[PDB]
Amino acid sequence: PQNTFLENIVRRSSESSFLLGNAQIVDWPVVYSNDGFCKLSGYHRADVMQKSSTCSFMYGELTDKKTIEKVRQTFDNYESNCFEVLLYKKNRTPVWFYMQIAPIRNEHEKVVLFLCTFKDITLFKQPIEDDSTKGWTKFARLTRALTNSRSVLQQLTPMNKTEVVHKHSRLAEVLQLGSDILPQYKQEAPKTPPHIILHYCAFKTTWDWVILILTFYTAIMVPYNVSFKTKQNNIAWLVLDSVVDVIFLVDIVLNFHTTFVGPGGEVISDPKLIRMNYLKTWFVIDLLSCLFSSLKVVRLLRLGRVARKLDHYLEYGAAVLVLLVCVFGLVAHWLACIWYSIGDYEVIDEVTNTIQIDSWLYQLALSIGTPYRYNIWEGGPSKDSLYVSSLYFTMTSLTTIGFGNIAPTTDVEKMFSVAMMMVGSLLYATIFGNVTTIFQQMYANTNRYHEMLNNVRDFLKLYQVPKGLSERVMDYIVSTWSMSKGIDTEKVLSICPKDMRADICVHLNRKVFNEHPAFRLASDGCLRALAVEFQTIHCAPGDLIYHAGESVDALCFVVSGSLEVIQDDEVVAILGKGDVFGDIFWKETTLAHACANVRALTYCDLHIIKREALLKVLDFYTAFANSFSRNLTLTCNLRKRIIFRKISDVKKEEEERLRQ
């Protein structure tokens, strides 16, 4: 979905000086100045911007008061007009301009912008100039200002007193241009000319699959009809052929109304280019449809016509395996048809009207019971037994089995099998290369995990790591691969741009930015700065986050599980399910000593933000920092040491006092 608005204006204006300006703002500041307005006015695109769209920066002591109010009036209430005025220039040269103010709406009509296409007219207006010494210089400036008016604009009828053909010609031009040049400032979609079908539509996919099915049917059925010569008695076998031919003719017709992707861009819906491409490329498919062995062998090119599109149906994976099976079947069928075609030409030699003994059909008849008999020679084996036996031989010859009960033996079967054994070998090699590559690609995901497990196990066994640590490490590896099965967050987030990465990071930490009072008065430009530095750890029971001597270096937000803050082998706090613990990193300026052991009691989920990153973010948005300091209350500050006395010490002191 593109918002092309600056492309529709320029193409449909023929080198104008349009000066788009905002409408909702007071005084209507401009937002864009075309290059044409930068040469017909002398100003650059650094002084025009943020000035009024009424073109009030080139007023003066000679502009008429009868029209200076009218432009403001027509800007007040949203309507289009074609006033003309007298404006100055950067070099203080008076010149008459022809304004064409016209409103431009939103997707829902809200008049967002104000098109202000200009047009220089000086030859057609009365020459007036105050600061001049020679009167002919004004007439010279008349021609100097209008150079294109005598070349392409108004040279149709060059003759005097022709003022009306300049005013009344384009009074309501924008009204006539309401359909030509007044686009809609909306997020558009790929537009299609009339009677044009997109190639991403939900209709072309179904038609493509139907064409695939019908091409597979034709590939199966054409050689069988050509070689075995089934007599056309049933009506169905003819109406089906007629329907298929009509459908593929309709497909050829529809190929003239499809949009091919540009070589260096995206979809191009231009009929001329589409027709040129299809004329240049694919009459190989036009030959087959228009109208017997030769005709049907020509029709077989329809398989190539459906295979030219072998990217909308397929992928690289199991689909390639299915295609490899389907092409092996078709090759085994085509070779079975050619083998019977060869083996029927040699059975009966018409020169002597005698049967050839060293053929393959005669030996079939000699090893199946039914022989050939002479009336001409009458029938022999059936026709449902000459296809099974002809496919069986080619299956023995393509799978490299070769039982050898049906063998090539005359003169030509031996030199046809030499050609068959080459195509069979080539197909077998390609199949057994593709299968290996596909299987390696498929199982490359589950080999890294086992390799890592073996590496870790060998490491833990070589260095004689104790049983407890080895069990904990193996359990951690298995658990972390059981919920993150091959997915690495860093690799996926690295290939995304700076905008989508921040949004994904904000989405991941949605259980800390939503259910926490601290992250309430935070701008969208600050959440996308905090979320990038948030980490996450998946603790296990018994795991220690902070030991009794480590330095607290990061805030941690618990979103699942429970924690236990043990100090002097005494529980002083039980955090869990939305409790923040750590140190006040902003108002200390010093690292602290973790004065208690934080041990996990359940499989936890902590979101960690480091001290340096938190200070870097908080030292830049020095407005959210106040709210963060005034709204974040740590339930367990691991810098202040709590002082207490167990009851055992009290009892011992009481006993000591009782002693003396």
Place this chain on the structure above:
Amino acid sequence: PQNTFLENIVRRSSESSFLLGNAQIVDWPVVYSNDGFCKLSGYHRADVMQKSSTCSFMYGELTDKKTIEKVRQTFDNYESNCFEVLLYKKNRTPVWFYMQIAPIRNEHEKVVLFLCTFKDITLFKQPIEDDSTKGWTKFARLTRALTNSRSVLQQLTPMNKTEVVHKHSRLAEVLQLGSDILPQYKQEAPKTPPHIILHYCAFKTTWDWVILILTFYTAIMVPYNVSFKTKQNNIAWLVLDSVVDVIFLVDIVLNFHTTFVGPGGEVISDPKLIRMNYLKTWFVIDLLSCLFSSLKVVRLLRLGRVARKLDHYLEYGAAVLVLLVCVFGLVAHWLACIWYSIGDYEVIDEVTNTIQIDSWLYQLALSIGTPYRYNIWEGGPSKDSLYVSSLYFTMTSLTTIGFGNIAPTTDVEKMFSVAMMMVGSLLYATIFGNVTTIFQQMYANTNRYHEMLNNVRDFLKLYQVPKGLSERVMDYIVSTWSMSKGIDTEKVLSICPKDMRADICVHLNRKVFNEHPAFRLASDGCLRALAVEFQTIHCAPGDLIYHAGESVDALCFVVSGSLEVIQDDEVVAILGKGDVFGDIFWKETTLAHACANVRALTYCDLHIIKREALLKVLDFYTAFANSFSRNLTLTCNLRKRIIFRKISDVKKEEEERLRQ
């Protein structure tokens, strides 16, 4: 092993205000306040914490002295009671609360915690209020305080003078709740409901393997009985079938008492979910057990029943190869049974009672001696020769050998072999993809080492490195791969969390932290900080650690071998087996010049800690640094240069003096 204690309390309390507090500490500080206690008291979970668990932070001038002593009494000696008191609130609103103090023990009874579940009761107590202007406001507050009491708590019998049904109803409620809500504060284990069997237990694995063996037996034996039709004469072949059927029925019964792992978690021992899952999933296996070709072909689904669990038995490696062999055998057996089933229906045509000559059993009888004879047609070949010959043909057809002495030739054997040659090709392709992938994974470990050796050899040969250096480099590579065969410490330590990495690093350097006086008064939080930065080098004889001009930058502890400190080609120290050498990095603030060559005399083992890391650790724990400086004595300080004079110089000076 999870320590779930905050989950058992909340579920079994029905939205209470439990206020767990410590017991061993004096005054019983609290350690956790439920959200309920944060709305029935107005306090947040930042002021309640570290206050007394007797709820002494909401006392006042109206609480009764007859019960304020009783709560302290029952807290002194560990016992449970259900006192009720009058307490204030954060907004100074008097309200009556119903305390339910109850002790909570450890794994070994030590009364760790004190559950202090509260309950608001105001409607049922005498309305008393001091700071009020209107008397009806107190009655309004009676209803305002108790909103859930008229909805779910005590709306069973709404009627007046019903005070007893509020007091005596739950006097000893915690005594009745001693089994409902009073968990044990211990590191628990996955608990199982009665009559529920875990799937990790040592019993389910043996039963699974038994099911695997019996399914393999059934897969072997069912087609043989169906096709070859062995007459059931022996008692064993029937009692074995009955026993197998009974065992698999018992397996179906036990499948109702197994725990399947949750889709987004771990084991779930809930009978309702287990039954719902098994009802939804697997009556395909219930059909086969309950009660002839069709029945046994249905029974063959038991193989799918045992293959659905193809992750508890298998792995990715040689086990896949064993499975591939075992499935090839079973396919060759099933095809051998189907081939004999086809080849027995065609031998004798019952329409004419004549033998078909172009079958495969008749040609077997014609090429094995024993023919078929007519009495009906009597027996021919034996029954132990019709299975060997039927498996031989399928082995020729699946291994793509095809001797062709037994061949498909009638009408149906040719169209059954066409279907056999497709499944054979598919199985062969999958097998030869899996074998290649498995072999690549297996031998990928020993290809990196040879590739590195070849790279190093080509590097040393291209640049014409001298013989000595090349030999030393190759020996070093071979030696370092002979004791670290593929294991990289950094990769294994990088995939571990911050807690296990420190423990592993401490374990690795156990020969320096134990047998050294310097690392004696070191806290557990300091050894885990030093051990991460310790390195290790495996020297070789003749290798120099510090040359005569290098800068000493790290402390080195020798744990194996011997070293030689040569200065001016004179030995001044022989370090070995627990001797530290280097420079005093803390009390110098300046880099030094190594004034002697430290050469290895034997295959050594040095543990190296750099200067910057050592200073960073020692500048943070400024209590261990004093002990480290007062307990570490270097036996060879490579900053102080020793001054001496060889005897040769003395002799030369004496000779010079004797000269004149």
